[PDB]
Amino acid sequence: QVQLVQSGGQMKKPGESMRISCRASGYEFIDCTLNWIRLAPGKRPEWMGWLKPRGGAVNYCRPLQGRVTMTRDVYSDTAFLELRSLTVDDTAVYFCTRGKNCDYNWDFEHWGRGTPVIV
Amino acid sequence: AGDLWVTVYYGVPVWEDADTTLFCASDAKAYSTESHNVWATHACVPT
Numbered sequence: 731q732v733q734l735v736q737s738g739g740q741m742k743k744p745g746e747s748m749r750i751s752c753r754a755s756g757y758e759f760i761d762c763t764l765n766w767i768r769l770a771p772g773k774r775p776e777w778m779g780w781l782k783p784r785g786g787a788v789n790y791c792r793p794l795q796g797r798v799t800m801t802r803d804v805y806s807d808t809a810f811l812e813l814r815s816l817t818v819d820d821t822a823v824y825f826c827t828r829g830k831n832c833d834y835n836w837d838f839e840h841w842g843r844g845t846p847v848i849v
Numbered sequence: 850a851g852d853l854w855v856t857v858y859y860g861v862p863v864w865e866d867a868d869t870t871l872f873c874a875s876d877a878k879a880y881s882t883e884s885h886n887v888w889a890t891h892a893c894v895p896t
């Protein structure tokens with residue numbers, strides 16, 4: 731089976747930045763697309779953008795266009811996400827997520843263990 | 850002007866001892882393509 735081990739959830743303050751990693755295993759890191767879906771209190775699970783680790787191709791969600799920055803070290807098979815200009819509202823638990831197969835990104839069978847950031 | 854003749858049969862159930870090249874067939878149960886085996890390679894035909 732595949733698994734996505736993640737970073738520890740840091741404690742932050744508004745008007746700052748955060749960076750949370752996500753290491754993948756059990757599959758070819760390049761062949762499949764990875765997402766970042768955070769979950770805040772009560773709101774629908776918010777998808778922020780997918781990352782295709784071939785050539786770092788990305789597609790960010792409209793409200794996050796400007797703050798979000800999804801990268802990856804294809805060598806350490808690690809997925810990175812930076813989020814500047816922090817808010818108490820964008821506070822959430824973060825989950826790196828790849829689909830069922832590489833033919834379809836949106837069936838998220840594989841989730842990573844939640845990383846809890848506090849703002 | 851005879852009685853018996855040579856008659857030829859194809860598919861006759863006979864064998865002789867022999868040495869030949871033998872190829873490999875694997876059980877194909879190795880799911881992980883990443884972690885591939887040194888003996889049960891991809892060239893092994895499926896069982």
Ligand SMILES: *[C@@H]1O[C@H](CO)[C@@H](O[C@@H]2O[C@H](CO)[C@@H](O[C@@H]3O[C@H](CO[C@H]4O[C@H](CO[C@H]5O[C@H](CO)[C@@H](O)[C@H](O)[C@@H]5O[C@H]5O[C@H](CO)[C@@H](O)[C@H](O)[C@@H]5O)[C@@H](O)[C@H](O[C@H]5O[C@H](CO)[C@@H](O)[C@H](O)[C@@H]5O[C@H]5O[C@H](CO)[C@@H](O)[C@H](O)[C@@H]5O)[C@@H]4O)[C@@H](O)[C@H](O[C@H]4O[C@H](CO)[C@@H](O)[C@H](O)[C@@H]4O)[C@@H]3O)[C@H](O)[C@H]2NC(C)=O)[C@H](O)[C@H]1NC(C)=O
Nearest residue numbers: 745746747790793794795796797798799812813814815816
């Ligand atoms: C293809 O071609 C494309 C187009 O050419 C390329 O696209 C470009 O890509 C680059 C990225 O590679 C992108 O760059 C941006 O860079 C920003 C960094 O700049 C900031 O800092 C500088 C430096 O200021 C400090 O240093 C100087 C001296 O060096 C000093 O004079 C300053 O006072 C200041 O010093 C301070 O500190 C010292 C410490 O000692 C003190 O002593 C001192 O007293 C000071 O306190 C600033 O100059 C910048 O300011 C600009 O941007 C701000 C943003 O609000 C403006 O307010 C500011 O007026 C100025 O904007 C100018 O340009 C605009 C547009 O023309 C004018 O309207 C305006 O009037 C000014 O003339 C920066 O503060 C970086 O921060 C930035 O990212 C941020 O901004 C974007 C929006 O722009 C946000 O969305 C982000 O979220 C970030 O907040 C960005 O990365 C270029 O902008 C981009 N080009 C365009 C047109 O967009 C492309 O790369 C190329 N190649 C490919 C492959 O595509």
